[PDB]
Amino acid sequence: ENRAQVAARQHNRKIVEQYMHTRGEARLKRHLLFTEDGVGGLWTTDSGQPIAIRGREKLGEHAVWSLQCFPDWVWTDIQIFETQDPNWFWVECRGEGAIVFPGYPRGQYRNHFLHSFRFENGLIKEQREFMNPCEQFRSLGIEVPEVRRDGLPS
Amino acid sequence: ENRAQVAARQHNRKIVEQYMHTRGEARLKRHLLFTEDGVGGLWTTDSGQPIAIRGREKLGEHAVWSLQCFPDWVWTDIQIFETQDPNWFWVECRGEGAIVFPGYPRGQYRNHFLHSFRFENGLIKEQREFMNPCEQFRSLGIEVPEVRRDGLPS
Ligand SMILES: CCCNc1ccc(C(=O)c2c(-c3ccc(O)cc3)sc3cc(O)ccc23)cc1
Ligand SMILES: CCCNc1ccc(C(=O)c2c(-c3ccc(O)cc3)sc3cc(O)ccc23)cc1
């Protein structure tokens, strides 16, 4: 059983590596790293609800929109964390690139991200990314609220 | 070497568990889980810069303000992730409690969190927590910007 867990972890790590280094036109095929019913998404948004895409083929359809809205996106400063679960990885990284959201001025977006990858049968069953939406607001020219600090010492 | 790494991971895990379960008056002594020069803080804020405190004694001083602003805070749904680094852990959890920020109405704050814990010689050298600040804005009655989605399909 330990041999099976070790083998799963090693293979899954290669998939995480491949995902994190998928750039440019290869983004059109990144969905093939998911199970048929795999889910990917952004878990931190202005609404408090995730923007999640469910199903490998729907993830592939979304990559068209991803490549339009973030045409040169790269992940950088990538640190991959294996865990005691051979099917669960975390990644700390940054990401950056142009942001071209319809109805907003073209901007430059940079942020810090955490990703969660859960695997089933050697492919990604659930990917989730987490960031501070305030930095995306800034990239879109959206005013960020400020918490008044007068009575809040650090 | 492997035995030493195994020993470090097992002890460090106990410190993470203790930190995550610390609530109530025990919060006044949570800083004793840190190295003398240890750092803790919130990495996701409206400004884009962390609110971090460096030094065990300064962390202890801050606990007074933590108990004022978050008088009944509890971490729930705790999942601890060991990693390939015996001195690095991640935690996925939620947190909840009253929020009592000076000059804002008293509110009820709930959020999802990720924590990072890095250890040195059996104590926490760096703790960092990550959340979506939009949920904290809501708890304070602060208006959250909304990204227009008319052109952005999911
Ligand atoms: C592959 C799974 C989906 N992955 C993502 C990745 C990034 C985003 C994203 O940046 C955001 C939106 C979006 C929706 C649909 C679309 O076509 C493109 C962008 S709306 C919105 C509001 C905010 O407050 C913050 C971020 C976003 C959304 C989903
Ligand atoms: C030593 C560990 C530091 N740990 C924390 C934990 C939580 C916060 C926090 O919620 C925030 C503030 C705060 C500052 C000083 C203080 O006394 C109490 C609260 S201001 C602010 C603005 C935002 O946009 C979002 C969050 C916060 C800050 C620091």
Numbering used by the authors:
A (entry chain A), B (entry chain B): 12 to 165
Question: What text appears in the publication on this structure?
Answer:
Modifications by the enzymes PhzE,34 PhzD,35 and PhzF36,37 lead to the highly reactive aminoketone intermediate AOCHC (2).38 Two AOCHC molecules then condense to the tricyclic phenazine scaffold HHPDC (3), either spontaneously or catalyzed by the enzyme PhzB, which is a homodimer and belongs to the nuclear transport factor 2/ketosteroid isomerase family. can be further converted into different biologically active phenazines such as pyocyanin (4) by the enzymes PhzG,40,41 PhzS,42 and PhzM,43 respectively. PhzB in its homodimerized form displays binding sites for two substrate molecules (2) in each monomer. The C-terminus of one monomer functions as a lid, shielding the binding site of the neighboring monomer and thereby contributing to substrate binding and stabilization of the complex. To this end, we initially confirmed the target by performing cocrystallization of RAL with a PhzB ortholog from Burkholderia cepacia (BcPhzB). The active site of BcPhzB features the same amino acids as the target enzymes from P. aeruginosa (overall sequence identity: 58–59%, sequence alignment: Figure S1) but crystallizes more readily than the P. aeruginosa proteins.
Most ligands interacted similarly to the parent compound RAL. Representative examples of 10i, 11a, and 11e are shown in Figure 4A: the 6-hydroxy group of the parent scaffold forms two hydrogen bonds with Asp57, one with the side chain and one with the backbone, respectively. The carbonyl oxygen of the 3-benzoyl moiety interacts with Gln147. While substituents in the 4-position of the benzoyl moiety (series A) occupy the same subpocket as the 2-ethoxypiperi-dine moiety of RAL, substituents in the 2-position point toward a different region of the active site, which is also the binding site of the substrate analogue 7. The binding pose of the ligand’s core scaffold was observed in two positions, in one of which the 2-phenyl moiety is shifted upward and the 3-benzoyl moiety is rotated compared to RAL and 11a. To prevent a steric clash with the downward-shifted 2-phenyl moiety, the Trp76 in 11a flips, constituting an alternative rotamer without affecting the hydrogen bonds with Asp57, His73, Gln147, and Pro164*. All 4′-alkyl amines 11a–c were active with IC50 values between 3–4 μM.
